[PDB]
Amino acid sequence: SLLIRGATVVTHEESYRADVLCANGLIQAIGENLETPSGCDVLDGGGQYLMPGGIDPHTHMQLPFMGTVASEDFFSGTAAGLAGGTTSIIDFVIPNPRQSLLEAFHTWRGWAQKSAADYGFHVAITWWSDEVAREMGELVAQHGVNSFKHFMAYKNAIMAADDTLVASFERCLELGAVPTVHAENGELVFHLQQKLLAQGLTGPEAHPLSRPPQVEGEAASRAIRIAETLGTPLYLVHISSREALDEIAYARAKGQPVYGEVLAGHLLLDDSVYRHPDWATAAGYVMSPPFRPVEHQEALWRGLQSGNLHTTATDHCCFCAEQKAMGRDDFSKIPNGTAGIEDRMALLWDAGVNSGRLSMHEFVALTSTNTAKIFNLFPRKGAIRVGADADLVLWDPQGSRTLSAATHHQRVDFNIFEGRTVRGIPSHTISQGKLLWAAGDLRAEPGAGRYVERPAYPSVYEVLGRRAERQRPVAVER
Amino acid sequence: SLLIRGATVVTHEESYRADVLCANGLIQAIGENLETPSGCDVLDGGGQYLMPGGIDPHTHMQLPFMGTVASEDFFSGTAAGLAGGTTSIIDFVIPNPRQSLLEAFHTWRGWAQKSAADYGFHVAITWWSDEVAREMGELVAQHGVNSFKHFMAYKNAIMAADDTLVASFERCLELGAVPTVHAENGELVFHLQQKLLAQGLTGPEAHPLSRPPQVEGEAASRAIRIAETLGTPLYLVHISSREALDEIAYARAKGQPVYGEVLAGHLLLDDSVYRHPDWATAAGYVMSPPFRPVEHQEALWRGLQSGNLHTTATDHCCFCAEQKAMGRDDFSKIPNGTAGIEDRMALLWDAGVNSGRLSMHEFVALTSTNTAKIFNLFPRKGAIRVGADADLVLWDPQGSRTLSAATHHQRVDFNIFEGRTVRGIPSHTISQGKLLWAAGDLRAEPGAGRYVERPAYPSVYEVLGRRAERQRPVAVER
Amino acid sequence: SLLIRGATVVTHEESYRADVLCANGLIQAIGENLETPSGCDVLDGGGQYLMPGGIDPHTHMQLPFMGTVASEDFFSGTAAGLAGGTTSIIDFVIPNPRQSLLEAFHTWRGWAQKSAADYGFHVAITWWSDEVAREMGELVAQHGVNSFKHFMAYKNAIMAADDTLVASFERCLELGAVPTVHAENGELVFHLQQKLLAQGLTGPEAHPLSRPPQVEGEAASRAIRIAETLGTPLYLVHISSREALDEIAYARAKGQPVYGEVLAGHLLLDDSVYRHPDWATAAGYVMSPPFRPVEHQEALWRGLQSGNLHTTATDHCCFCAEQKAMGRDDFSKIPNGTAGIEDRMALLWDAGVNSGRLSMHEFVALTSTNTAKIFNLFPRKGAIRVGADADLVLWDPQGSRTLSAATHHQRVDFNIFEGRTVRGIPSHTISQGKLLWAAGDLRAEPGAGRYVERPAYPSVYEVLGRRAERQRPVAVER
Amino acid sequence: SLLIRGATVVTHEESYRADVLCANGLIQAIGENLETPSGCDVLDGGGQYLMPGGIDPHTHMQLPFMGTVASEDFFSGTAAGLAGGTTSIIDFVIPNPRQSLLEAFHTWRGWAQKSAADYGFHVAITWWSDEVAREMGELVAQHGVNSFKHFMAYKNAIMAADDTLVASFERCLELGAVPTVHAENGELVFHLQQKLLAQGLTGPEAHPLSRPPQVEGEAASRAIRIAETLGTPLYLVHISSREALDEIAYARAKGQPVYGEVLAGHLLLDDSVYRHPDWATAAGYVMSPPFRPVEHQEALWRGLQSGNLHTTATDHCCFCAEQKAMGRDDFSKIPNGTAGIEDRMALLWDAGVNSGRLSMHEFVALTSTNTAKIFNLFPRKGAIRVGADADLVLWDPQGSRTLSAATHHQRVDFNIFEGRTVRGIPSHTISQGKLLWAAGDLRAEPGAGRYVERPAYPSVYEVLGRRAERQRPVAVER
Ligand SMILES: [Zn+2]
Ligand SMILES: [Zn+2]
Ligand SMILES: [Zn+2]
Ligand SMILES: [Zn+2]
Ligand SMILES: [Zn+2]
Ligand SMILES: [Zn+2]
Ligand SMILES: [Zn+2]
Ligand SMILES: [Zn+2]
C-alpha cells in the first residue's frame, strides 16, 4: 500500500492535482486529501507530475542474434527500464526459420521469468506453413499474444516475402491479432551490402549506405498496402525516415488504421555518427534502420505532432564492444542494436516537452497510452484510474541527469547519447503498486514481473468488420 | 435522480457494459448492477449505447441577419437539439460594427435565458479599436467567454481584414482565448457576386458560383498563417472544401494547432441542390460556404478519418420561405443559413458509423469530446465519468427516422435532408440529469438551461508558451 | 429601449418631473424632454409616478413543505409579482436536515431557471456541522449569497437551537453575511399544538392560539441578543407582533443594527379570520406567524413610521384548497402559507399613502430601497439613476383594482384580501428595461429573469469592526 | 473651475471612486478620470474622502443678547466654519418684542453681507400680532424664509407662551413653513434662578441647577403636542436630555414629523465642567441648555444611532471672558453661548466615526444632508450630484488636530474642548466651487457668501395634507 500525495496527475489528455492510493497492485482511489490507511506508506509528490508508467513495446532482452546473445537480460533490462520510468515492456519471441512458434515461446517464457516488471511478447513469423498458422491460433487463444511481427529484411534468414506476409496477415485478421512489421526492403539491403563490401567499404560508414531511407519507405508502402488489401490494422516498428512516415500519412489520410513507432535515437541522432574515426564508437551506433541525415529527424517530430506516429519504443538490443567487434572487418556482421530502455522517457521529455514541441499530455500518450490502446491493454495500463494497474512514474520536471555508460543501469558499455544532459527525470517509479526506483535507489527483484496477456480483437476490429460487411462483393444479375 | 441501466457505455476511447447513475446535475456513479437509490427513476437501455450528449459549437438562434431575424429561437432550437441528442450549444454574439461588445453580449444573454439546455457564446470581432480590445479582456475575465469569432467574408459589413485579424489574434494570445474564423475571401466573394449579377444570373443557382472552393482555401491559408505567425491556436468553422482541408492538413503536418469543424450538410450534399427547379427549394440550401461538388464530400470524410477535422456542428441558422424570398430578385439578398441542430448526430451516425467509416469512439469524439477539449470544457462535458455534467444520449442502433420538415422540431419550414431515412437514432436525451427527450416525447422546458462559462488558457497555450521561448529571436553582438 | 415620458420620478427621498430612458437593461438617461432615439418605444407616463420596481425579499415559489409543494412555481410567481409592480425577489433554499447546502442550492437554482424577473436566494441553516460551515463560505465566495436564514420554530424538523444560532451567526460574521431569522419559540409552539389537539381543538381557530404573540417576542429577543453578543447584524422576517417590534426598537435604541420586515397581511388583518364559519376560508389564512389581535396592526404601522420596521415582503407561499385540506382534522397539518406577491405594493399604497400614514418616499423605501441597502444591492436596485438596473413601476394614483382569486395572476385559488378594492395601482411594470405588465396585459416570459448575486460585507460590517476594536477585552497583569 | 481628482466620494448613503468637476458655483460632472478642461485648477484628493460641505443650521453671528454683542461676526464666523469644513449656515433674525420682523430682517441682512460662505436665516417670533402674522407671510413669499424660531424660555424677554406658539404654528402651517423651538420651560427656569440666587448660589455651578433636564423635556413635550394638534412639522433645536429625546422618540413612534438637532457639546461634555474652581473657566461653558450629567450623553448618541435625532449644529454664539464676567456675581447674567462652528465636523467624525458609533454615511447625513432635506435645500445642498452647489469638503482620515482657543480661527478666547486631540480632519474646503481652506491656510473673503432662499412647503407637507383630508369632521344627522 502506497499513497502518493501532493502531485499533479497528468494523463494522456489532462492534468489535475490529486492524491493516488495504491494497494494489491491496483489504483484504489484518486482524490484530494485522501487519508492514509494504516499499513500504507506515503510518498510526497509535491511539485511533481504523476503519470502512467512507460510501456516500451519494442525490446529484445537476451536476444540470440547475429552470432551472439544480447548483453542485457530480462532482469537487468527491466530493472533499467524501471530506473528510467518504464514499467512494462513487450519483447519478441523470434523463432528460427522452421522452428515451432510454441517451442520458441516457452523458451522465451523461461528467459523472461527473471523480469522485475510486467512483460509480454510479440511473436515473430519468420517462416510460413499450416503449422505456423495453427500455432498462431494457439498462441492467441491460450498464451495471451495478440500481435505478430514480420521482418521484411534479413534475406536468407528470417525475411518474410509477400506470400508469407499475405498468408500471415490473413491469419491475424482471423484471430483479431495485430500484425507488426520491420519495414526495410531485404533484396535491396542484401544487394547494397554485397556491392559495398565488394568495393572494400567494410567499416560502419557503409551501414547507412547499405540501407538508405527509400528502402524503408518501400517496405512500409508495401506492408501498408498489403494491410489495406486484406483489411487488417498495421503497426510499423522503428520508423526512421520521411519516406516511411509519408506512406503512413498517405494511408491514414484515406482512413486506414496504420500506426507508427519511433525511437528517441531516430529523433535526435543523425548519420554522421557512423563516420566517426574510432571504430568502436561508430559501431556503437550500428542498428537497423540506421540513423539518418538530419532532414529525417525533423520529419519524425512533425509526425509525432500531427498524429502520424503514435508510440515510442527503444528496440533495446544491447551489445558490448567485443560483441560489436565481430564485424570489425565486415560491417554486415556487426550485431545490430542499441540500448535505450532507461533513457527513452527522459530524452523524449527533454527534447519534446521542454522545447514546447509536445505537450505533457502527448508525452503520456506517446510513452504509454497509445501503445496500450493499440495492443488492447487500455485502461489496464497507460491510465490513471481506479482499478487500473498501479504502474506509475513520479516525474521531477527540474531534475537533472547526464546519460553515460559509466552510470546507466543498462548492462552494456555504450550509450548512444553519451554525455547528454536532460532536464526532467523520473524521481520515483512504481510497478504493481511497489516503489522500485526511488531517487537513486533501484529495488528491482528478479521474478517480480508478471507475464501480461493481451486479449485479441482490439476495437479497431469492430470498425473493420462493419467496413468489410459494407463492402462484401455482390454478383451482377445477368 | 435517474439510473440508466443495461446499456453499453461508449466514450471517445472505449466501450463497456455498465449502469450510470445521475443526480443533482452530475454523474454520481458508474458500474455494473448499481442499486436504484430511493426516489430515483430508472431508464432501461438494454441493446442501446449511452454516449455523452452532443455539443454543437456553432449555432445562431434568433440571429438578426441579412435584414431579418432567424425563425428558430433559443428555446425552440435547444429543444430541437435535445430531440436529436444534442445537449449543449455554443452560439455567437455578433455586434454591429462600432457597437460595444459588452452591450451585444448582454442583449444575447437576454435572448438566451429561454434556452432549455446548457448554452454558451463565442463573441465576434466585427470591428476594431482599443475599446474592443479592452472589452475582449473583460469578456474573458468576467463573463466566461474564451473564444472570439472573425469573419473573413462580408465586405462592407463585418469583415475583418488583415490588420484586425492580427490585432485581434494577438489579443487572443494575451488572454488565452481561441480565435475562430469564418474563412472565405470576401473581396473575391464580392467581386464574383457583382459579376454574376452583371451577367444576369440572379437566381439561387448563382450562389455556389459566387463563392467557389478556392475562395475558402485562400482564406483558410491566410488565417492559418496569421495564427502561425503570432503563435496562437486557430479554430476554422464549417470547412467545406478540399482546398481548406488541405491547408489545415499542411499546417498540422508542421506541428501547428489548427482545428476544423465540419457540417453534416457539407459531408452529404452536393452543389446539384442549387439547380433545383423550385425556387424556394433551391433557396433553402443557400448558405455560406455553399454545398460543393462531390469530390469535396469525400475529401472531408477522409479529413474526419485522418484527424485533420475535429468537430461537428450545424451552423443552425433558420429562415422560412418568406424570409429566403427576400432574395427573390437577387441571390445575394437571400438570407444565408440552414437548419441542422436536431439532425447532426443521426446524420453522422448513419453515414459514418453504419458504413464503418468511423468507429463509435470517433463518433463520440466528433460530436462532443473534441469540441469540449478545444474550448476547455473537458471533462466537465463530452465525458462519461463521475463528477461530469449529466448530459447524455441513449442511442438505439436499430431505430429508424425519416427526416422531414413535416415532423422535425426545428421551427423552420425546410430541411436540407427532407426524405432521408436514418438508422440509429437517439431514443432518449438527458440534460443536467433530467430526461428531456423520450422516444417521441419532447419535454423541453423554457429557461431550464444554464449559461456555460469556459475558462481561458486551454492547455495548448502552455505548449505554445514553451515553444515561443525556445524559438525567441536572439540579437547578434557587435 | 424604452423612453418613459411625462412622469414624476418618485424615489426614496425626492419627487421630480423627468423622462427616463432605458436601454440594455439599465437606466441610460434621466431628463426633462428627452429625445426619442429611433427604435425606442415610448411609454406615456403622464400623471403617474415612476418608482423603483418592488423588491420582495421573502418568497417561497414551489417550496416542497408540510408534505406537499407550493402551487405557484418560479415563473407563475414572478409573473404575478410583475403584474403587481414587483420586479425582483429573494427566495429561500431550504436544505432538509443533513442535506448538503450546495446540493439544495443547485436543485433550487434549476427550479428558478424558469423565473421571469430577476431573482436571488437566501440559504437556510437547517442543521449544523463543519461541512455546513464550509459550504456557507463557498456559497458566499462563489454563488452570490450574502444572507442565511434560520428558523427558531419547527421543533424536530429544521429548528435551529441556540448552539446552532451561535455557531452560524459567528460563521456569518466571518463571511460578511447577514443572518436572518424566523422568530417563534419552537418549544412553546410544539407544546401548545399538542395541548390544543389533546383538548380536541382541531380547527383553524386553534392555529393562532398555538403560537400567541409572546412566542414571537421571545424568539426575537433571543435572536437579537445573540446577534448583539456576537457582533452581527440581524434581519427578522415577518414581524407580526408588538412584542417582537418592541424588541427591535429596544435593540436599535442601543445602537444595534437590527432590521425588521413586515407583510401587508400583518398590517391589515387580525386573528378573527381564523374563526371564519367556512373551514376552507379559515384555513386559507393559516400561516406562521398567524394574524394577530388588532392592536398589533396599529403597533406595526407605527414601527414603519418610526423607522423600526424597514422592509415589506409577502412570504409568498401558495397552497390550494385541496392542499390546505390535508389538515382538515388537525390544524397543525394545514400547510402554512398565504399568497401576496402581486398585491403587496397596491395594498401598501392604498392603506399607507392614501391615508397619509406614509409619504411616497417612505413607500419606495419600504418597497424596494431599504431591502436593497440591507442586502447590498443598492444602487444597482431600488434606485432611479443612470446605470442602475431598469426595474421600474409606473404607478397610477387614480387607478383602481378589486382584489380577487378569480382575477389575480397568482396561481392559487385563494386571496386573503378577497373583495378588497384599492386605489392607486401599478399601470406598467418594466424589468431589465422591458415592458412586462401594461394596462392589464401580462407579457412575462419563462426564463427571462437573471440570477442576482449579492456581495458580502455590506457597510454595516465596517462599523461593527470599529466597534469591536473599541470594545476589545483588555487583560490585567498581576 | 476646479477638478477634484482621485478622491472617494462619500454621501449620506454610499461611497464610490470618482472625480468631481466644479464650475460656475456648481458641480458639473462626476466620473472616473475626467479631463481637466483648460482654465481649471486641479486638486489631488488621492486617498481622501470627498463629502458635501457641512451645513450648520444653528448660528448666532454677532447676536446682540444679554446686554452685549457676540464677539464673532458674520465674516469671522463663516470663515471659521470653512476652516472646519462647514460651508453654509442658517443664522437667526431675532427681533425685539414689538419690533417689526421685516425691519429686523433687513438689519440682519446688512450684518450678514460680509459673510464668506453661503448663509440663510430663521426668523424668531418674539411677540405676536396681526402685523407679526402678515410679515411672516411676506418673509416666506419675498425673502426666502421657510422656518420660524420660537423661544419657550426667557420670561419677560422673548418667551412665547402657548397662545403665541399656537397662533404662530398655525400661521407656519398656512405658509408651508417649518416651526423650530428652543424648548425649556421659562417659568421653571425663572423660578429656579430666583431660588438659587436667594440661596446665595451665584456661581456658574448654579447654572445647570437652574434648568435641569425635565425643564427641557417638558417644553419639548408641549411644543410637540402643539405641532401634533395643529398638524405641523417641528424641529427642536439643541436637544441635550434623555427626557426631551424620549418625547421625540414617542412622537415619531406615533408617526409624527418631529426632528431633533444636537450639538457636539451635548454629546461629549458633562455638567462637571461648571464646577471648575476657576470662575472664568466654568463660565466659558455657560449656555442654554447647559451641559448635563453623563447619562444624557450616551442617550443622545443612541438617539443619533436610532434615527431620533436628525441634525448636528453648534449654536455658535461667542462671548469673550470679559463679556462672560458680566455675570461674575450672578450666574443668570452670564451671557449664554459657546463656540463650535469650526469644530463640529471634526468632533463628530472623531467621536462618532472612529468609535464605530456612526457610519460615514450617517456622518454625512448628520452634518449636512438631513438639515438640507428638512429645510428644503436638498439637493441643491448636502448632495454630491450634477447641478448641486459645489460646497464640498475633502477629509483626511489620518490627519490630526488639537483644539485650542490659542490656535482656532473662531474669534473668541475660549474653547469648550480645549486640548482635545482629534483624528480625522478637513484638509480642504470648497465653497461655491472655490477652494477656501487648504493645507492649513484660510482664503475666505468678506462678502463672498450668498444669501440662500429656502422655498416653502417641503415634502413633509404632502403627507400632512393627506392626513388633514382624512380628518374631515362630519356632523351627525338628526
Ligand atoms: Zn527491427
Ligand atoms: Zn527490433
Ligand atoms: Zn460562417
Ligand atoms: Zn455561422
Ligand atoms: Zn417564516
Ligand atoms: Zn417564509
Ligand atoms: Zn437656544
Ligand atoms: Zn441658539
mmCIF file of C-alpha atoms in Angstrom, chain A residues 12-14 252-255 302 305-307 350-361 373 378-379 385 459 463 466-467 470, chain B residues 12-14 252-255 302-303 305-307 350 352-361 373 378-379 385 459 463 466-467 470:
data_model
loop_
_atom_site.group_PDB
_atom_site.id
_atom_site.type_symbol
_atom_site.label_atom_id
_atom_site.label_comp_id
_atom_site.label_asym_id
_atom_site.label_seq_id
_atom_site.Cartn_x
_atom_site.Cartn_y
_atom_site.Cartn_z
ATOM 1 C CA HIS A 12 -2.850 11.494 -21.997
ATOM 2 C CA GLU A 13 -5.490 14.195 -22.031
ATOM 3 C CA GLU A 14 -5.488 16.303 -18.800
ATOM 4 C CA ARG A 252 -4.183 7.439 -42.596
ATOM 5 C CA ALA A 253 -5.460 10.258 -44.832
ATOM 6 C CA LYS A 254 -7.591 7.566 -46.617
ATOM 7 C CA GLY A 255 -8.840 6.358 -43.258
ATOM 8 C CA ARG A 302 6.375 16.586 -37.178
ATOM 9 C CA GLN A 305 2.913 16.363 -33.520
ATOM 10 C CA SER A 306 0.494 15.607 -36.353
ATOM 11 C CA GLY A 307 -0.741 12.168 -35.117
ATOM 12 C CA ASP A 350 13.616 16.833 -22.510
ATOM 13 C CA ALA A 351 13.691 17.216 -26.283
ATOM 14 C CA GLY A 352 9.878 17.205 -26.673
ATOM 15 C CA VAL A 353 8.159 18.830 -23.669
ATOM 16 C CA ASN A 354 10.855 21.336 -22.687
ATOM 17 C CA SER A 355 11.146 22.540 -26.276
ATOM 18 C CA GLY A 356 7.405 23.007 -26.493
ATOM 19 C CA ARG A 357 7.262 20.533 -29.359
ATOM 20 C CA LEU A 358 4.964 18.235 -27.354
ATOM 21 C CA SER A 359 2.514 18.778 -24.553
ATOM 22 C CA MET A 360 2.739 16.767 -21.275
ATOM 23 C CA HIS A 361 -0.449 15.080 -22.357
ATOM 24 C CA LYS A 373 -4.784 1.200 -26.760
ATOM 25 C CA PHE A 378 -6.041 0.119 -22.088
ATOM 26 C CA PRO A 379 -7.169 1.064 -19.420
ATOM 27 C CA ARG A 385 -7.931 5.443 -12.852
ATOM 28 C CA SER A 459 -11.690 -2.272 -31.026
ATOM 29 C CA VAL A 463 -14.846 -0.789 -37.334
ATOM 30 C CA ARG A 466 -18.521 -3.016 -40.372
ATOM 31 C CA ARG A 467 -16.330 -1.973 -43.275
ATOM 32 C CA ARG A 470 -20.436 -2.905 -46.081
ATOM 33 C CA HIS B 12 -14.386 8.854 -27.227
ATOM 34 C CA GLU B 13 -11.997 5.934 -26.365
ATOM 35 C CA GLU B 14 -13.740 2.781 -25.184
ATOM 36 C CA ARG B 252 -0.920 20.317 -38.757
ATOM 37 C CA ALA B 253 1.877 18.394 -40.517
ATOM 38 C CA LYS B 254 4.187 21.178 -39.285
ATOM 39 C CA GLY B 255 3.054 20.872 -35.668
ATOM 40 C CA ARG B 302 -11.137 11.439 -45.061
ATOM 41 C CA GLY B 303 -10.332 14.560 -43.079
ATOM 42 C CA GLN B 305 -10.882 9.822 -40.503
ATOM 43 C CA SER B 306 -7.346 11.234 -40.536
ATOM 44 C CA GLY B 307 -7.740 13.706 -37.609
ATOM 45 C CA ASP B 350 -25.998 6.869 -40.153
ATOM 46 C CA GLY B 352 -20.159 7.396 -40.621
ATOM 47 C CA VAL B 353 -20.778 4.560 -38.155
ATOM 48 C CA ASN B 354 -23.081 2.212 -40.053
ATOM 49 C CA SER B 355 -20.780 2.424 -43.114
ATOM 50 C CA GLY B 356 -17.742 1.679 -40.958
ATOM 51 C CA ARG B 357 -16.076 4.941 -41.824
ATOM 52 C CA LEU B 358 -15.987 5.959 -38.193
ATOM 53 C CA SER B 359 -15.841 3.880 -35.120
ATOM 54 C CA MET B 360 -18.348 4.695 -32.412
ATOM 55 C CA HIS B 361 -15.497 6.232 -30.371
ATOM 56 C CA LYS B 373 -11.299 19.757 -25.261
ATOM 57 C CA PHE B 378 -13.492 18.680 -20.871
ATOM 58 C CA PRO B 379 -14.126 16.667 -18.807
ATOM 59 C CA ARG B 385 -17.293 9.960 -15.651
ATOM 60 C CA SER B 459 -3.640 23.561 -22.274
ATOM 61 C CA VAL B 463 2.821 24.235 -25.084
ATOM 62 C CA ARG B 466 7.345 26.875 -24.171
ATOM 63 C CA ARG B 467 7.508 26.804 -27.916
ATOM 64 C CA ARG B 470 12.591 28.125 -27.432
#
